[PDB]
Each structure stands twice: as structure tokens, then as C-alpha cells.
Amino acid sequence: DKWLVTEGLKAGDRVVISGLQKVRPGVQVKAQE
């Protein structure tokens, strides 16, 4: 269900996955994982 991505991301990166409405770029956000 996931993408392997050869590049551009690193370990420990918290993926902002959902919330595609409440998140426009740059907006502050409270993570959930």
C-alpha cells in the first residue's frame, strides 16, 4: 500500500499523510502517528 521512494526522504521523517484539507503547505500542524 506504500511507496518505496529512492530519494528525497530520510529516516525519522514524519510523513504527513492524511489531513490533506487542514494542511496547506506551511501551515502549522499537530502530528498524529
Binding site: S18, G19, L20, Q21, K22
Partner: protein, 1044 residues
């Protein structure tokens, strides 16, 4: 004529009787709905080209049809949607009153030309031509109370045993399914193919040749030989009734004759033709049928016609099925109307008391009582012969007519008693001179008031019909009241009144009645006692009038102007939208959290929810969701908080806390198009064929510029859908054909597998249903799966895609549009509140003007009509000033005396503004129409007061003051009989809460203040206007008594 029926009352009553009979057979037979239909007709066509993107759809179908669409009348515009569902909807908007049937004709007669052109995938998936509203009439849910039927279980039974019917029944513009029909689904395993070395095609034709309806003919058919003793048709391969017959389909015989079957290569199972949709009814598996009312057809009669087809079906329901009616728009219509019936009745009663408090006798009070219904009843037939129906406003013309109707009798009736008060003549004779002196003004007054209510029925555009409802019914009963006042009432005064002695005002009476008449006369005498001193100074009050009129000029302008109240409908919808590429699971998940909200955080107010996945107004596809909710009756929803207005907001606020979901709850306005003050409908267009991506960067250019004026723009949004990564195979052709594989088979093996495909028909239980082949989901889930698909080349060797296939990510739009045959990016926003419509639109157009080369743009819908030449109203009211005056100076045969009359208009205009402006209400339809009511009355007294005082100075020799006084005091009592009778008439509505209470309060209050300030302010102010203009434009020895 009164003298005629005075001698012929039975011949009179028989007239009133008759008017009650026709009206009776009128009332039975008229249509009912909430409103006149102002909805402009349009036609929809809808395509299915399964498995496709919107792009493919658009190009091989949409524009195809577009290039055919021409030379058809009353086209306003055409809108179109292509989508990756493989779907089309092309809407063509036609001028109102344009013929629905024809439009469907003329369009489809074009359409058939493109048909042979359209992809066969289109032709068998079929197309549809719908004349219907963009909105559903009612939702009807279905479930298994026993849970013995799953959704598809419920889906199909609806489909075959129900759907066609509601789709046949007249009045239904469309039957939308929530569910799917069963199909014979064929689920492919490539590795079984290649292990058996085959292609989907291999599966397919075999279905055809081996799913067959054939006609061997008949043994001994015609023509025969001579002597043939035997005749029979021949019976050959039959359409398949079941899976098993499919699985035993022969992919081929072999050289040895070895079978290769289907059930080895595939899963055969029943299923919904498309699975795109799911609903549940308050949280369990369900299906149902979205209903859209036939354009021009009548809901209430449509709806009930729907509930007959169902009830017919109920006996034959299998175990557990139950009909549930999550959404029905009809019941608010019916209920809020008969609340006009109660009021009309209850108001009828209220007359009888007021008349009684005055008359203090049984029979007498009947006389004003029986005239009211006859004319109200008499006006229904008018609706019929003019070809009207029943509705909100017309039913409101009924009440607003009473105020006129009831004033007529009283004035007629009171007059007859005064002649008996004054002269002691018996009623039978007392009627005649009473009638004789009033018979001229009753008539002429009917011509003036008409000049008030006639001008409104010419209102331009859509609104034209709205206000037009009243003027006809209102001028209907106005005509009628007179005729009855000339015919019925007099014979009622002759027969049904007490004679009275000369000089008896009721004083000798013992009890509250005497005490009552004993106070009234002392409230009158002191009352005149002012209008005496009031006219000892004419001037001081002229300034007191300047004050008021400016106050009137202060509020009316300050009072906001709007269109029609949105009434709580006790039913609503939450639209959900999810980003593209979203799996139905990502939508399904939302639904619960949305539903879940309706099942708890609102319980009491919530009766039910029937919610969906994959559908909404979109169209189809998984990232959309909608919820039909049932609220219990208003009776279960007390307080402003428990209404839909309130409820929605909480929801709107709450859902906001969710991730991934353009969601909002809404409750639809009085009309889709009709807007008192909302947002707009705008179009970016591609004139140069610039291309979508150029538009988005043109559109996003507009929004980004748009969004910079919140003080003007607000909520500016694209209606549609951003691009999404796609899976794009680029076939190396030479390789393939270097391999000897055939493209179509490649393509074929693709769309059918990854997009599904429709083979042919079959039967389920005597019923036709559709065949489908497609990849077992697990195989079609993902990109790599392509290389699982192997192909027979010229050499028989089964060849993968991945060798001749190469694929990539990239964008395409999930959804696509055009408008009137050009690419359109629709955009929705609204005026920054405190900004009035055009101001937003100006800045829109302005913001559009700077856009890159070759960019066009357009407006439609609300903004379409917006170009309307409104503002014909002021021109007409101005006109209506002129008829009124002239008619006075006609009735009065003087250019001056009309002026003493017309000065009263601001006194009732002021009163309504106040109360409405006290309560929080608006300047609107209901408010305007009642002022004209407050006018017509408040003008009617200022008319009659003037008729009297003048005839006094004209017929008798009373001097001015002595004449003016006699007019009003003689006229004091009738007025209070009209006003108070009328005041209470409208009381139920000012107290009204619940269904219909929105219109009503506006009706009542805007009436309440008007008549109040009509009543007491005027009767002071009229005597002054007579005398003042009387004096100013005076002449000769006039003033002091010159008699005779």
C-alpha cells in the same frame, strides 16, 4: 343590482351557494406545490464509456455531441462533465416556459446523429436523455430488518422488481440508483490464462458464441411443402440463466478435443454492475433510489404516485425488506399549506367574535361571516379558470384578501345599521339608501386598489411569477367582494339584521354590552375632541408629518432587502468530498464519522440517516460522499438551536475537525436559482484551445487574485478537481508488432481487465442482466500487475506487457468540464458580506480582464439571470402612483382632492418597517405585499373619509370642519371593525413557530405594525389632508355653511 336581490334574496343566496359549489369542485381539482415553477428547463444527456479517464470520454464523446448541438431554440447555455468514471453529463439550459417535451425531442433528434459515431462501448452502455431537476425529489431507503439480505441483495431486488416502475411512472424525470443491478461478473486470472496460454478475448468471444439467443426457425415453417402435417419452431442455444452455464463455457476445443473451460480461468459470480456506490440506512447495509422530479411535473402528485407503485410491490417483498423514506421533500409542502387553511378558518372565526363584540347578536354576526368564505372560496375557481395551482404565496393571497373582504361587508353592514341608528328605518329599507350612497365608491375603489395590485403581475423575469401569484388572487377577491357586496350582503342586511329605533346607539343595553357601547361612544367623542383641536391648528401637524415620513425614509433604506425566507425543512444533506485517488474506504471511513455524528451528538433532533459512498453531486467515484438525514418533526426540535439552520452549523463546525474531507452540511434554499444574497457562478473558458493546464494556471491566477479581496470576494472556490498521478503505459509499437502481437487485443486485454468491459446480456429469473469480464481485484490493484498480463502474438507465444509495455506516473484531471462547448473552469465564490452581488462580480470581471491571452470567461445560473434587466419595479411603482391619483381625480373628478387621500401612505408603511425592524426580520416578498395590504386598507379609509366629508359639503350644506368631522366620526366605528377584526386575523402567524413559521411571522408582523399605525395615526391625519388641500386649492364663499 342590490335593489334587485333585496327583492330576491334566495336568488341572491343561490348565487353565493353556487360560488361555493364551483369553488368546491375547484378546490378538489387544483394542483398543489410549494411554489410556482420558475425553474428554467434544461436537458441532460448522460454517457457511460466504462474504464476511461475524463479525457478519453471528453474527446470521443463529449465534443462529438457538442459539434452536433446547434439550431435548437431557447438555448441559454450548455454545460458538460467528463470524468474518469467513464461518465458524461451534458446539460442544456433553456429559457423558462420553453417546452420540456420538445427540448427533449429536438435535442435527441440531434443526438441520434452522433450516435452512430459514438463508441459502441457508449451505445450499449446506452445513453439517457433526462428532463429533470438537478435535485432529488425524495430518497427512499431499503433494508433487511432481518439482516437476511446484504446490500447487493437489496440492491438488485430494488433494481428489477422496483426500479423500472418508478422509472416508468409519469412525473419521474430520473430514477437514480443507490445500489447496482446484478450482473454476471467474470473475474480473470492471467496466470491461469498464460498457464492456459490465453487472453481475455479468448474468454470473451467464447461467451458470445456460447452465450447465444438464436432462432433455428421452426420445423415445417412457412412456406412449406404440400402435405406437411407438422409445424414447430426450432429451439437452439439459449441465453444463460446462471453462472454454471458460463463456467462451462468453452474457451476452445482442442486438437484432441480437450475442453478448456471458463470456471478454470475465472471467478463467476453475481454482482452489482458497478460497485461504485454504497449506502447504509442509519448504519446498516442498504440501497435505495434517488428520485428527481420530471421537469414541469408536480411533486406532491408525483410523490404519492410513487407511493402507490411501492405499496403495490409490498405484498411481494421477500423476507426482511422494508421501505424507509429517508428523504421526502413533499411533506413540508403539504403541512405548511394547511396551516394556511387553519389560519384562514381560525381567522374566519375571529371575525365572528369581533363582529359580535360590535354587533352583540347572533344572526347579525353571520352577515360579515358568510361573505368572507364565499369570495375566498370564489377566488379558488379564479385560480382554476386562470389555470393556477395551490401554493405558498397564493394561499397567502387568501389571508391578505380577507383584510379587504372583511372591510367591505362591515362598511356595507355598518352603514345599514347607521341609517337605522340615525333614521330608525327598518333594515330592509335601510339597506337601500345605505347601498345607494356607497354603491359608487365601492365600485370605483375597486378600480384604484387594482391599480395597486395590477402593476406587480407584470414584474420582469423569474420573480415576475412570484409576486404575480398575489395580484391575481388578490385582485380576484377584490373583484368578487364587490359583486357579493352588491348582491349577497344587501339581502343579508335586509333579512338577517335587527331593526333599531331612531337614535339608539346601543346605550340602553344592560351589561358589558351597554357598558361596552357606553365606553366606545366616549372613546369616540373624546377622539373627535382631538380632531376638533387637531384642526384648530392645521400647520403644527404638517411638520409632525415631515418628521415621520423621514423616519419612514430612515428605516426602509436601513431595512435590508432580501428575497424569500429559507424555511426549516427538517431534512438536509451533508456533502462530503475527499481528495482524488482516494479509495472508497477512505470515503467510507468518513461516512461513519459523519453518520456517527448524527447518531449521537444529534439524537433527539435526528430521526434517521441514509448515507452513501461514491455518490453525491459530483458525479460518481469513490472520493465523494453524501448523507441524507432524517430529522424528526419540528415538534421534536424546539428552540432555534434544534433547527436545521442551527443543527447544520454545529455539524459544519464539528466535521471540520476531521482529516481529509471537503465536508459541509447544508439545507437547500427556497429555490436553487433564486437567491436573495449569496454567492455566484463564474466561468473561465478556453477560447484559444490553450489547454487545461493553461487554465488551471489561469484559474489559480484568478483565485490568487480573487482571494486578495475578502472585503469584496468571499468563499471563492473552484467547483472541480485538481489533477492526479496516473498510470500511463506507453506501448512501444514496433516491439509488439516485432513480436506479432495485435494492438487491439493489447488494448482489449487492457480495458476489459483493468477497466472492466461489457460482453453481452443474460437472464436472471426471467429478467435481463449484464455480463462483465474483468481482472480479479488483487490482480488489478497495482502497476506491477501489468506484467502479469501476457499476450498471444502471431506466434501463439503468450507475451507480457512489460516487454512491449512501459509505463509512468503523471497527471490528468480526475474530472473535466466544458461549457457551451469550450473548456470551463467553474469557480464559486460570493460577495464579501456587506457587499452586494454585482460588486463582487464587477471585481470578478475586472480580475478577469487582466488574464493571459486568448482567455475567455462567462457567468451562468444565478449570475446568468443576474444580467436580467431588473429594476423595473421602481418604474412600475412610479407608474402605480399615477393611476391611483388619476382614478381618485376620476372618482373625485378633481385633480386636488386625491392629494388629501394619498398623504396617508407613509403611516402604515412606517408601522411594518418598525415591527419587522423590531424583530430582526428583513425587507422581502412577504413584507412588500403586506404594506400594499396595509395601504389598500389604510388607503381605503382615507378614501371613504374623503367621500363622506365632501358629499356632506356637496350634497348637504355642511361647512368644511363640520363636514370633515361628520366624516370621520361617522366613519370612526367601521374602521375599528375592519382593523381589529383584521389585526386578530393575522395573530396566529405572528405567534407561529415550527413549519411555515418563517414566512408567517414576516407576514403577520409586517402587517401588524402597518395596520396599527394605519389605524390611529391616519384617522388623525386624514381630516387634516382633506381640509388643508381643501383650503389651499379652495375658492369662492365655500367655507361657512352655504346650504344647500
Amino acid at each position: 343590482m342590490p335593489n334587485f336581490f333585496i327583492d330576491r334574496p334566495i336568488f341572491a343566496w343561490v348565487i353565493a351557494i353556487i360560488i361555493m359549489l364551483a369553488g368546491g369542485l375547484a378546490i378538489l381539482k387544483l394542483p398543489v406545490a410549494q411554489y410556482p415553477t420558475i425553474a428554467p428547463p434544461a436537458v441532460t444527456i448522460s454517457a457511460s464509456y466504462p474504464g476511461a479517464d475524463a479525457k478519453t470520454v471528453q474527446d470521443t464523446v463529449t465534443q462529438v455531441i457538442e459539434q452536433n448541438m446547434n439550431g435548437i431554440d431557447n438555448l441559454m447555455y450548455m454545460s458538460s462533465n467528463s470524468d474518469s468514471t467513464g461518465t458524461v453529463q451534458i446539460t442544456l439550459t433553456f429559457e423558462s416556459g420553453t417546452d420540456a417535451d420538445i427540448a427533449q425531442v429536438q435535442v435527441q433528434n440531434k443526438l441520434q446523429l452522433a450516435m452512430p459515431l459514438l463508441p459502441q462501448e457508449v451505445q450499449q452502455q446506452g445513453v439517457s436523455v433526462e428532463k429533470s431537476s438537478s435535485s432529488f425529489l425524495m430518497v427512499v431507503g431499503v433494508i433487511n430488518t432481518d439482516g437476511t439480505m446484504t446490500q447487493e441483495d437489496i440492491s438488485d431486488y430494488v433494481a428489477a422488481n422496483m426500479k423500472d416502475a418508478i422509472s416508468r411512472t409519469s412525473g419521474v424525470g430520473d430514477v437514480q440508483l443507490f445500489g447496482s443491478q446484478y450482473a454476471m461478473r467474470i473475474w480473470m486470472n492471467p496466470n491461469e490464462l498464460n498457464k492456459f496460454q490465453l487472453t481475455p478475448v479468448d474468454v470473451i468471444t467464447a461467451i458470445k458464441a456460447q452465450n447465444a439467443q438464436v432462432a433455428a426457425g421452426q420445423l415445417g415453417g412457412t412456406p412449406p411443402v404440400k402435405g406437411q402435417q407438422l409445424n414447430a419452431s426450432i429451439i437452439a442455444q439459449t441465453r444463460l440463466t446462471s453462472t454454471e452455464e458460463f463456467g462451462k463455457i468453452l474457451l476452445k476445443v482442442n486438437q484432441d478435443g480437450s475442453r478448456v473451460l471458463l470456471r478454470d480461468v475465472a471467478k463467476i459470480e453475481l454482482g452489482g454492475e458497478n460497485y461504485d456506490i454504497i449506502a447504509e440506512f442509519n448504519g446498516q447495509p442498504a440501497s435505495g433510489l434517488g428520485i428527481k422530479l420530471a421537469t414541469g411535473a408536480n411533486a406532491l402528485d408525483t410523490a404519492a404516485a410513487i407511493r402507490a407503485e411501492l405499496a403495490k410491490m409490498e405484498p411481494f417483498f421477500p423476507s426482511g425488506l422494508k421501505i424507509v423514506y429517508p428523504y421526502d421533500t413533499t411533506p413540508f409542502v403539504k403541512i405548511s399549506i394547511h396551516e394556511v387553511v387553519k389560519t384562514l378558518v381560525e381567522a374566519i372565526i375571529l371575525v365572528f367574535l369581533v363582529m359580535y363584540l360590535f354587533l352583540q347578536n347572533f344572526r347579525a354576526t353571520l352577515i360579515p361571516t358568510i361573505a368572507v368564505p364565499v369570495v375566498l372560496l370564489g377566488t379558488f375557481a379564479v385560480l382554476a379558470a386562470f389555470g393556477f395551482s395551490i401554493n405558498t404565496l397564493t394561499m397567502f393571497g387568501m389571508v391578505l384578501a380577507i383584510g379587504l373582504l372583511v372591510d367591505d361587508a362591515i362598511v356595507v353592514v355598518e352603514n345599514v345599521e347607521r341609517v337605522m341608528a340615525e333614521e330608525g328605518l327598518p333594515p330592509k329599507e335601510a339597506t337601500r339608501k345605505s347601498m345607494g350612497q356607497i354603491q359608487g365608491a365601492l365600485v370605483g375603489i375597486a378600480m384604484v386598489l387594482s391599480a395597486v395590485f395590477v402593476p406587480m403581475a407584470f414584474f420582469g423575469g423569474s420573480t415576475g411569477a412570484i409576486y404575480r401569484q398575489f395580484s391575481i388572487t388578490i385582485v380576484s377577491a377584490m373583484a368578487l367582494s364587490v359583486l357579493v357586496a352588491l348582491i349577497l350582503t344587501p339581502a343579508l342586511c335586509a333579512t338577517m339584521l335587527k331593526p333599531i329605533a331612531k337614535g339608539d346607539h346601543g346605550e340602553g343595553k344592560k351589561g358589558f354590552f351597554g357598558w361596552f357601547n357606553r365606553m366606545f361612544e366616549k372613546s369616540t367623542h373624546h377622539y373627535t375632541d382631538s380632531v376638533g383641536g387637531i384642526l384648530r391648528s392645521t400647520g403644527r401637524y404638517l411638520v409632525l408629518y415631515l418628521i415621520i415620513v423621514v423616519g419612514m425614509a430612515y428605516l426602509f433604506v436601513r431595512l435590508p432587502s432580501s428575497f424569500l425566507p429559507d424555511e426549516d425543512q427538517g431534512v438536509f444533506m451533508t456533502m462530503v468530498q475527499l481528495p482524488a485517488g482516494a479509495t472508497q474506504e477512505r470515503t467510507q471511513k468518513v461516512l461513519n464519522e459523519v453518520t456517527h455524528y448524527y447518531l449521537t451528538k444529534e439524537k433527539n433532533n435526528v430521526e434517521s440517516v441514509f448515507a452513501v459512498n461514491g455518490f453525491g453531486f459530483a458525479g460518481r467515484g469513490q472520493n465523494t460522499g453524501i448523507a441524507f438525514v432524517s430529522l424528526k418533526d419540528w415538534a421534536d426540535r424546539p428552540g432555534e438551536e434544534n433547527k436545521v439552520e442551527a443543527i447544520t452549523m454545529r455539524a459544519t463546525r464539528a466535521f471540520s475537525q476531521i482529516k481529509d474531507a471537503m465536508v459541509f452540511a447544508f439545507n437547500l434554499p427556497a429555490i436553487v436559482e433564486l437567491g436573495t444574497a449569496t454567492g455566484f457562478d463564474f466561468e473561465l473558458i478556453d477560447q484559444a484551445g490553450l489547454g487545461h493546464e493553461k487554465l488551471t494556471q489561469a484559474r489559480n491566477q484568478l483565485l490568487a487574485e480573487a482571494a486578495k479581496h475578502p472585503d469584496m470576494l468571499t468563499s471563492v472556490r473552484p467547483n472541480g478537481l485538481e489533477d492526479t498521478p496516473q498510470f500511463k503505459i506507453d506501448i512501444d509499437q514496433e516491439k509488439a508488432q516485432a513480436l506479432g502481437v495485435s494492438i487491439n487485443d493489447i488494448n482489449t486485454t487492457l480495458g476489459a481487465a483493468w477497466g472492466g468491459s461489457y460482453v453481452n446480456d443474460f437472464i436472471d429469473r426471467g429478467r435481463v442482466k449484464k455480463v462483465y469480464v474483468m481482472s480479479e481485484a488483487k490482480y488489478r490493484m497495482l502497476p506491477d500487475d501489468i506484467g502479469d498480463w501476457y499476450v498471444r502474438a502471431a506466434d501463439g507465444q503468450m507475451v507480457p506487457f512489460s516487454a512491449f509495455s512501459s509505463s509512468r506516473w503523471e497527471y490528468g484531471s480526475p474530472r473535466l468540464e466544458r461549457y457551451n462547448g469550450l473548456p470551463s473552469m467553474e469557480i464559486l465564490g460570493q460577495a464579501a458580506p456587506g457587499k452586494s452581488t454585482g460588486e463582487a462580480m464587477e471585481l470578478m470581471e475586472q480580475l478577469a480582464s487582466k488574464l493571459p491571452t486568448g482567455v475567455g470567461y462567462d457567468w451562468t445560473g444565478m449570475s446568468y439571470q443576474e444580467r436580467l434587466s431588473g429594476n423595473q419595479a421602481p418604474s412600475l411603482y412610479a407608474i402605480s402612483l399615477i393611476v391611483v391619483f388619476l382614478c381618485l381625480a376620476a372618482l373625485y373628478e378633481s385633480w386636488s382632492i386625491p392629494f388629501s387621500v394619498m398623504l396617508v401612505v407613509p403611516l402604515g408603511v412606517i408601522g411594518a418597517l418598525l415591527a419587522a425592524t423590531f424583530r430582526g426580520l428583513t425587507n422581502d416578498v412577504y413584507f412588500q405585499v403586506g404594506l400594499l395590504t396595509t395601504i389598500g386598507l389604510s388607503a381605503k379609509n382615507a378614501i371613504l373619509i374623503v367621500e363622506f366629508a365632501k358629499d356632506l359639503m356637496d350634497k348637504e350644506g355642511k361647512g368644511l370642519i363640520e363636514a370633515t368631522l361628520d366624516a370621520v366620526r361617522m366613519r370612526l366605528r367601521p374602521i375599528l371593525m375592519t382593523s381589529l377584526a383584521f389585526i386578530l386575523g393575522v395573530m396566529p402567524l405572528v405567534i407561529s413557530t415550527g413549519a411555515g413559521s418563517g414566512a408567517q411571522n414576516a407576514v403577520g408582523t409586517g402587517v401588524m405594525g402597518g395596520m396599527v399605525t394605519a389605524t390611529v395615526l391616519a384617522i388623525f391625519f386624514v381630516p387634516v389632508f382633506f381640509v388643508v388641500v381643501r383650503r389651499r386649492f379652495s375658492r369662492k364663499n365655500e367655507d361657512i355653511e352655504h346650504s344647500h
